[PDB]
Each structure stands twice: as structure tokens, then as C-alpha cells.
């Protein structure tokens, strides 16, 4: 049975106006800005952007990749598909 989201989990993350996007739950570094309550720091593969999202916008990657894991014309998306498949836990800073 599922647990709560934890750093390192792989997802497709939904933002308004964007397709479900390959991403991971990030850690928060000591001394770094924390997310709002009930939100997680989401790192988006390909764009390498961070936004704060709740579970309603987070789709576990294994279950969802057949639906969401196809190339998309949007900037950074296809690079993102490569990262989540091939090195999802690397440093992208």
C-alpha cells in the first residue's frame, strides 16, 4: 500500500497550462527556503525549475508513464523524459 510522498519519489507533476511533467520530490538543503505547509518542493526535469505543489497535482511515475510519458513539443519536456528515465537522482544544479 502507498506511503506519503518523500524526497526522491518520481512523479508527473501538473501545473495549470502545462502537460503533466516529469519531475521528482526534492529534498530541502539546510539553510534553504522551505515550502508552504502541505506543499512539496517539486523539481521539474528538463527545465530544472522548482515549484511547490500538493499531492493533488502529483502522479506517481511508474503508474502514470504509459499515459504521460510521450514526447511533447513544450520547451524542455523531451530532455525531461530522458532525465527521469536515465538519471533521475543526479545533481542538475
Swiss-Prot record:
Query: Which positions fall inside the PWWP domain?
Result: 7-64
Name the tissues where it is expressed. Answer: Widely expressed. High expression is found in heart, skeletal muscle, ovary and testis. Overexpression is frequently observed in hepatocellular carcinoma samples.
- In this UniProt entry, which cysteines form S-S bonds? none
Localization annotation: Nucleus; Cytoplasm
Top-level lineage group: Eukaryota
Instruction: Quote the subunit structure annotation.
Output: Interacts with HDGF. Interacts with trimethylated 'Lys-36' of histone H3 (H3K36me3). Interacts with trimethylated 'Lys-79' of histone H3 (H3K79me3), but has higher affinity for H3K36me3. Interacts with IWS1. Interacts with H2AX, POGZ, RBBP8 and CBX1. Interacts with histones H3K9me3, H3K27me3 and H3K36me2. Interacts with DPF3a (isoform 2 of DPF3/BAF45C). Interacts with SMARCA4/BRG1/BAF190A, SMARCC1/BAF155 and SMARCD1/BAF60A in a DPF3a-dependent manner.
Protein family according to the UniProt entry: Belongs to the HDGF family.
**What biological function has been recorded for the protein in this entry?**
Acts as an epigenetic regulator of myogenesis in cooperation with DPF3a (isoform 2 of DPF3/BAF45C). Associates with the BAF complex via its interaction with DPF3a and HDGFL2-DPF3a activate myogenic genes by increasing chromatin accessibility through recruitment of SMARCA4/BRG1/BAF190A (ATPase subunit of the BAF complex) to myogenic gene promoters. Promotes the repair of DNA double-strand breaks (DSBs) through the homologous recombination pathway by facilitating the recruitment of the DNA endonuclease RBBP8 to the DSBs.
Q: What is this protein called?
A: Hepatoma-derived growth factor-related protein 2
| Native source organism of the sequence | Homo sapiens (Human)
> The organism's lineage?
Eukaryota, Metazoa, Chordata, Craniata, Vertebrata
Q: Which gene encodes it?
A: HDGFL2
User: What stretch of the whole protein does this chain cover?
Assistant: 1 to 93 of 671
Amino acid at each position: 500500500m502507498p506511503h506519503a510522498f518523500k524526497p526522491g519519489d518520481l512523479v508527473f507533476a501538473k501545473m495549470k497550462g502545462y502537460p503533466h511533467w516529469p519531475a521528482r520530490i526534492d529534498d530541502i538543503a539546510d539553510g534553504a527556503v522551505k515550502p508552504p505547509p502541505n506543499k512539496y518542493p517539486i523539481f521539474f526535469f528538463g527545465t530544472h525549475e522548482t515549484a511547490f505543489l500538493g499531492p493533488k497535482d502529483l502522479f506517481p511515475y511508474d503508474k502514470s508513464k504509459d499515459k504521460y510519458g510521450k514526447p511533447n513539443k513544450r520547451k524542455g519536456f523531451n530532455e525531461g523524459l530522458w532525465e527521469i528515465q536515465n538519471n533521475p537522482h543526479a545533481s542538475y544544479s
